[PDB]
Design a protein around this ligand. Structure first.
Ligand SMILES: Cc1cc2nc3c(=O)[nH]c(=O)nc-3n(C[C@H](O)[C@H](O)[C@H](O)COP(=O)(O)O)c2cc1C
Lengths: 845, 170
């Protein structure tokens, strides 16, 4: 007889067995009286808002009642009704519940009372799943990374909610860990009297002291280790895999400043008792490190004046760490020695840790670091200064420097004296690690812990305190999937190590939080690790070395072409010719080149009436091979050109001429103007070249509104054009490339100073970001404007062609000093409108 | 209007280049060393340069490994990606239609198939050249799904045949 649970406006119907409807009903009488009254759309945090959530609260309420033979039958009914062929993949079902429109989109009503009750009522999960994801060794590789100290401010509620939902998978673990913690507590009194009892704090939230005490290194070190241990144990337990054999699925593992202890402990574990023993030894070491790093360098009272002035300048609360962003290492090291020239060696500021080319953290006493950032604020420029109007070569350095949530000056000379005491504690207890199995890459040297003459713990204590962090040298990965079990979630190490590996084939899967999915899907979440599908269980990252790498093709007549994401639309070389008002108005430069098989667009500035355009287009079409098409380069600054050209293109397309592309010149139009361009007048792609970061945002907005029509971006970096919008050729796109590629219909080509294969190949392949320490960043095509002027087809005077030939070039990094002298015979001059113009340096110019 | 004088030097005063202004790029100028050469040959130089490097970086100097396609282009810059489930062909294929399985785009792709062949190009293309005159593809209009019709592409896409039940007869 069917059983129907009702609450508010939602009901769930399930087919229960007959001779249980009596005792299955008694639970129902006890279930309705424990839930809140409905209020304006099921908005209560404890209130169900979906049939699955309502039945999950039913299956979790029946667990506290001592009445078996129904709990497992209800679990099986839930799995059959809601988890089709993924009965052990509830993480995917929970996050798919978000996509439903009936359920109000929020993570609070999904994660708990569905996943909490499921694993509270589940039986033993010792069931090996479809673990074929790593069975293909040459195609998939797993690397576990471990976060460090200060990835987030309030890390404690991470472990709070992990115990709140995963009590059944960590209950025997955290009690055992805290027992050793409290056994080792009394030897280090008088420095933190407020206790170190995690169990009492979690069970009774009122027993937990303030976060000023909690965030301290001596307290947070054992707690962060417990966090990553619980995350790894949950990872091994949800799939029902022994940690010793789940470690077999991993190629190698390493950790952050603090996470290296977990990274090396992760391979000393074989069985559940062995892993528990190794975790017990690890959590003891972190107590010693926290205690002696606080007693060796106790942080004293800081005057309210300096912290107030630091907060008023947009920084954080002053800390032993100063994070400076957006500057190279050679600049940071240059500035820190200048800063320390006024400081002794006891307050010296030296490179502590390197999160990337443009994100470093320096170490020292808080007054020394505030003296450093006082200087940096003197050297820097505001965010709202609008750097676009002054040339890039002579703008001011931009940075955002602030202090991290850590209470110990790690990775500097300051703790170098503590290490000798620290290792003494290692000798004072049974702190020892057995044979390593998976390679662990050194944080400083990058080598393996297996080939060590010295032990492990006594060297990692030297590494955390004294040796600097060359973070990318440690994570020189050869793998596809990277799993972070540590703190922070979105605010931690995972995202900033994803930014360093965006296109190197590394797929970042966040095991800390489960609130998928992000709008861009840069990184995965907890569900991806536990997916049991054969080939659908693995989400692959953008591998821009192979994915957007060019390929080739052969023709039936025996000739060879290039296969790219611009050539394929063109059906020809991925090498276009930009529209130039002097140059590309000749019928012969467009017609006699299309016959060869290359793409050129005609610039409308050389024509002034629609009849002239029509007479030119007709002449080009009459002589090109029948079937090819041509583009039109329009200009946005003059409304007259627009108003006599847009009507022309519409009715010429209605007639059916080979008019194929519309490159809008300087000035990206609005969404409404570009709207009819895309829809009404019927082109294949729209050339919509911007000249600034705001313009690139505007064109991305134009691309979102029309997620069907190709849009060739044609971003010129103002290095070789006529009306060169003076900007760097790299920075405006180095920060927004992976904001452009979130588009099914975006095309990205680059110009501004391309003349040959050698200088264009790096941009197509993507290796142009090597000099800027970024992943491969491929371009769809490259446009050529200044290198085709000396062509035979161009009607530019032969004498000017010669003058250009004996006119030499300019190395890239010097192009912007063309405002003073004839740099390679080319200077910038003001136009009548104020736009800068590149012109061959001549007597007239 | 100081842009045309470089183009037409014979008009200006005494055909003096130094009096006129030529717009050119400081970064691309060193690449411009040859004068009065075909633009086709320039873009060639670049194209076969990319050929050579892209071969000698992963193809190990072998052009056989290259994935030759029949016609290069058509359905989007990316490799042709329709609804992959409905991207199918076969030797003996008949496509019965009802109200359950019509939809314009997916029907067109289903008729197109998998291989980049003459039929796939003919159906999928959004434009037909009429003596150097790009117009709309008529297959899109004439191959619209209709109730109780039937499309047969038997013998590995040698020919497509669309039937409809005229006067109650297919
Ligand atoms: C002589 C000349 C005229 C140009 N005219 C235009 C133009 O009218 N509209 C436009 O958007 N870009 C114009 N450009 C810039 C090109 O479209 C292209 O963006 C630029 O040349 C960058 O490529 P390059 O470094 O090889 O020259 C012109 C460039 C040159 C050299």
């Amino acid at each position: 007889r069917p059983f129907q649970l009702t609450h508010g406006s939602i009901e769930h119907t399930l087919l229960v067995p007959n001779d249980l409807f009596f005792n299955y009903s008694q639970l129902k009488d006890e279930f309705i009286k424990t839930l809140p009254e409905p209020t304006e759309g099921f908005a209560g945090d404890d209130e169900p808002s979906s049939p699955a959530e309502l039945y999950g609260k039913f299956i979790g309420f029946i667990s506290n009642a001592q009445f078996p033979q129904i709990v497992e039958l209800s679990l099986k009914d839930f799995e059959s009704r809601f988890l089709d062929n993924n009965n052990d993949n509830i993480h995917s079902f929970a996050v798919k519940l978000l996509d439903d429109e009936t359920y109000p989109t929020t993570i609070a009503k999904v994660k708990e009372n569905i996943v909490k009750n499921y694993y509270k009522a589940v039986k033993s999960i010792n069931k090996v799943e479809s673990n074929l994801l790593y069975h293909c060794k040459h195609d998939a590789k797993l690397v576990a990374i471990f976060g460090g100290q200060g990835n987030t401010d309030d890390y404690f509620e991470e472990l709070r909610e992990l115990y709140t939902l995963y009590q059944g998978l960590i209950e025997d673990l955290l009690v055992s860990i805290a027992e050793k913690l409290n056994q080792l507590h009394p030897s280090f009194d008088k420095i933190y009297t407020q206790g170190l009892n995690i169990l009492s704090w979690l069970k009774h939230p009122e027993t937990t002291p303030d976060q000023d005490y909690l965030l301290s290194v001596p307290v947070s070190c054992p707690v962060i280790c417990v966090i990553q241990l619980c995350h790894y144990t949950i990872t091994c337990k949800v799939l029902g895999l022994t940690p010793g054999e789940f470690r077999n699925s991993l190629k190698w593992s390493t950790g952050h400043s603090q996470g290296l202890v977990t990274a090396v402990t992760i391979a000393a574990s074989d069985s559940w008792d062995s892993f528990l023993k190794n975790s017990l030894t690890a959590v003891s070491l972190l107590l010693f490190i926290g205690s002696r790093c606080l007693s060796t360098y106790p942080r004293t009272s800081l005057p309210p004046t300096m912290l107030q002035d630091s907060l008023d300048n947009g920084e954080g609360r002053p800390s032993p760490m100063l994070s400076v962003r957006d500057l190279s290492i050679k600049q940071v090291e240059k500035f820190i020695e200048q800063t320390n020239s006024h400081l002794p060696r006891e307050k010296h500021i030296a490179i502590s840790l390197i999160n990337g080319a443009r994100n470093l953290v320096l170490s020292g006493p808080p007054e020394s670091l505030y003296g450093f950032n006082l200087n940096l604020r003197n050297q820097k420029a505001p965010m709202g200064l609008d750097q676009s109007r002054v040339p890039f070569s002579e703008r001011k350095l931009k940075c955002s420097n602030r202090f991290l949530p850590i209470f110990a000056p790690f990775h500097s000379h300051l703790l170098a004296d503590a290490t000798e005491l620290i290792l003494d504690d290692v000798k004072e207890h049974g702190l020892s690690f057995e044979g390593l199995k998976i390679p662990v890459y050194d944080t400083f040297d990058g080598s393996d812990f297996q080939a060590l003459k010295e032990p492990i713990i006594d060297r990692v204590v030297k590494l955390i305190t004294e040796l600097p962090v060359h973070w990318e040298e440690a994570t020189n990965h050869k793998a596809t999937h990277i799993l972070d079990f540590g703190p922070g979630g979105v605010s931690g190490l995972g995202v900033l190590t994803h930014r360093n590996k965006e296109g190197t084939g590394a797929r970042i899967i966040l095991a800390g939080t489960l609130d998928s999915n992000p709008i861009d899907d840069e990184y995965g979440f907890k569900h991806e690790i536990f997916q049991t599908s054969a080939d659908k269980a693995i989400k692959w990252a953008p591998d821009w070395l192979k994915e957007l790498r060019p390929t080739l093709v052969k023709n039936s007549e025996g000739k060879i072409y290039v296969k790219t994401k611009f050539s394929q639309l063109l059906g020809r070389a991925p090498l276009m010719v930009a529209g130039m008002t002097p140059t590309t108005v000749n019928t012969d430069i467009v017609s006699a080149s299309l016959n060869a098989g290359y793409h050129i667009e005609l610039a409308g500035g050389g024509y002034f009436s629609p009849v002239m355009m029509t007479r030119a287009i007709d002449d080009i079409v009459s002589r090109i091979k029948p079937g090819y098409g041509l583009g039109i380069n329009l200009i946005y600054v003059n409304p007259f050109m627009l108003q006599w050209g847009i009507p022309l293109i519409k009715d010429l397309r209605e007639k059916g001429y080979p008019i194929q592309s519309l490159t809008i010149g300087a000035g990206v139009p609005s969404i409404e103007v570009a709207t009819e361009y895309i829809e009404d007048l019927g082109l294949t792609h729209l050339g919509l070249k911007p000249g600034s970061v705001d313009a690139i945002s505007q064109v991305i907005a134009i691309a979102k509104a029309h997620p069907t029509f190709p849009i060739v971006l044609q971003w010129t970096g103002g290095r070789g054009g006529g009306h060169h919008s003076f900007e760097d050729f790299h920075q405006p796109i180095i920060q927004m490339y992976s904001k452009i590629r979130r588009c099914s219909n975006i095309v990205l080509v680059a110009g501004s100073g391309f003349g040959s294969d050698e200088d264009t190949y790096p941009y197509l392949s993507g290796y142009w970001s090597e000099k800027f320490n970024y992943p491969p960043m491929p371009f769809d095509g490259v446009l050529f404007g200044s290198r085709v002027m000396t062509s035979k087809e161009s009607h530019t005077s032969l004498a000017a062609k010669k003058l250009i030939v004996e006119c030499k070039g300019v190395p890239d990094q010097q192009w912007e000093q063309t405002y003073k002298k004839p740099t390679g015979g080319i200077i910038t001059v003001r136009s009548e409108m104020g736009e800068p113009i590149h012109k061959i340096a001549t007597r007239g110019v | 209007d100081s842009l045309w004088q470089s183009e037409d030097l014979e008009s200006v005063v005494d055909e003096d280049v130094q009096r006129t202004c030529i717009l050119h790029g400081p970064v691309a100028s060193q690449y411009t060393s040859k004068v009065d050469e075909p633009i086709g040959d320039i873009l060639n130089s670049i194209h076969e340069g990319h050929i050579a490097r892209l071969i000698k970086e992963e193809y190990a100097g072998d052009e056989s490994k290259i994935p030759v396609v029949e016609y290069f282009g058509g359905k989007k810059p990316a490799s042709v990606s329709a609804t992959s489930v409905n991207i199918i062909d076969g030797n003996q294929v008949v496509y019965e239609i009802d109200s359950e399985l019509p939809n314009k785009q997916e029907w067109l792709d289903l008729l197109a198939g998998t291989e980049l062949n003459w039929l796939q190009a003919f159906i999928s293309t959004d434009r037909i050249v009429q003596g150097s005159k790009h117009v709309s593809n008529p297959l899109h209009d004439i191959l619209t799904p209709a109730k109780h019709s039937k499309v047969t592409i038997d013998k590995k896409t040698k020919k497509l045949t669309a039937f409809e039940n005229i006067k109650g007869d297919l």
